Amino acid sequence: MGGFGLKNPPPQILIKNTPVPADPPTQFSSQKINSFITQYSTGQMTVEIEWELRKENSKRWNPEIQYTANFNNSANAQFSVNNNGLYIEDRTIGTRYLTHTL
Amino acid sequence: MGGFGLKNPPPQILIKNTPVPADPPTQFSSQKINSFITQYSTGQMTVEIEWELRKENSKRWNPEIQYTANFNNSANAQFSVNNNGLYIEDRTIGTRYLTHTL
């Protein structure tokens, strides 16, 4: 599907709500505790990647194809939110534009 | 016409073929020397400019218009020489693409 094959990829990160049981009966029972307190959780996360990139030196004379926002007027701008508040991606953008000698 | 107005612009550079007179007569004459030896000259020149440029930091989310080589197939490539050997410029390329807040 494309990508970087890794022997030792980034570690999976797993999270759970710790169970909080509801009021236990007064008499003892060895069976599992069936009833819990309904709860959920929320909070912010952040991810910081450091990328290394190969600089481009090409002596070709004439200009190259490059990615350009669509040249047309439109009811909704490209890669932007619409009236209802929904973010819309117009195109899958490949990485291959700049030419290189074979 | 656009450009950089300068009080002290780059100096004009002026060049001439030094005159070489033809064979003078044996008797003296005070009039100017009319006849010279036809000659011309040639050689390489070079110019080296150092340009300073303002880096671009813009936090807009969506992509921008950029200059792109014409997307079409053609009998002759853009900004390239043709069969007869003549270099042809397709477009005057303005400098204004990237947006900036007013």
Buried residues in A13-32 as b, exposed as e (16+ CB within 10 A): eeeeeeeeeeeeeeeeeeee
Q: Which of B64, B77, B80 sits opposite A69 (nearest CB)?
A: B64
Name the residue with tokens 């490539």.
B77
Buried residues in B64-97 as b, exposed as e (16+ CB within 10 A): eeeeebeeeeeeeeebeeeeeeeeeeeeeeeeee
Which residue of B58, B60, B62 is the best one to mutate when testing the A interface, meaning the one whose CB has the most A CBs within 10 A?
A: B62
Tokens found for residue A23: 């009021």
**Interatomic CA distance for residues B58 and B64, integer angstroms:** 11
**Interatomic CA distance for residues A48 and A10, integer angstroms:** 13
**Interatomic CA distance for residues B38 and B60, integer angstroms:** 65
Experimental method, per PDB record: cryo-EM
* DSSP assigned state of A17: P
Q: Is B61 in contact with A68 (Cβ distance < 8 A)?
A: no
3-state helix, strand, coil in chain B (%, to 5): 0, 5, 95
Resolution (A): 3.0
